[PDB]
From Swiss-Prot:
It holds the Pfam family SpoIIE. It comes from Bacillus subtilis (strain 168). SUPFAM superfamilies: PP2C-like. SMART domains: PP2C_SIG, PP2Cc. Keywords: Hydrolase, Protein phosphatase. Negative regulator of sigma-B activity. Dephosphorylates RsbS. Plays a role both in maintaining low sigma-B activity during growth and in reestablishing prestress sigma-B activity after induction. Could have a negative feedback role by indirectly communicating sigma-B protein levels. This is Phosphoserine phosphatase RsbX. PANTHER family: PHOSPHOSERINE PHOSPHATASE RSBX. The keyword Endoplasmic reticulum does not apply. GO terms for molecular function: L-phosphoserine phosphatase activity; phosphoprotein phosphatase activity. GO terms for biological process: response to heat. Residues 11-198 form the PPM-type phosphatase domain. It is an enzyme of class 3 (hydrolase). Its EC number is 3.1.3.3.
Amino acid sequence: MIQVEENEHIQTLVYQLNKEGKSICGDSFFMKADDKELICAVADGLGSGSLANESSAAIKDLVENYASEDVESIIERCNQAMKNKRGATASILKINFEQRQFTYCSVGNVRFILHSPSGESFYPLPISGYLSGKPQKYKTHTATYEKGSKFIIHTDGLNVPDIRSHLKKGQSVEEISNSLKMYTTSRKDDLTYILGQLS
Ligand SMILES: [Mn+2]
Ligand SMILES: [Mn+2]
């Protein structure tokens, strides 16, 4: 699955492929870009298939409903929703286009990498564990981005230690997605990523 969108402020590409033998993806995502802001979330439900999806899809729906809240408030709602489910790992990203400011919060092995034209990257270590309904302390990062910055958020089905090289070399999200194709052909796990190129 590929979905491409653009507006004045961002061009995006979402890619998803199910684990081998599965009809429903255990990963979910939500994204909405308008004239003012981006909300982007990617979640990996524990395990795969329908029961993983029960968890990640609940997160998708909460992010859609509560998109206007801050990232820490949204992620805690997601955590609470995991109480009677398998649970999930997740990342939530909000971008204010006018301020060129992003805010990011995550739990578990969903990765975010932001690459700037200054050749400096933000690629925070994943936070351990998963959203299970149990109390969490959350880490939020807030920063300005340079015009032309690019990012990826990806589930652990995508294993790319040299991701920053791909972001730096590629001149568009389409090119970067094509350069990642080699990592999608195994279907060992659900695999989801969102690429963005910011104006
Ligand atoms: Mn999973
Ligand atoms: Mn996974």
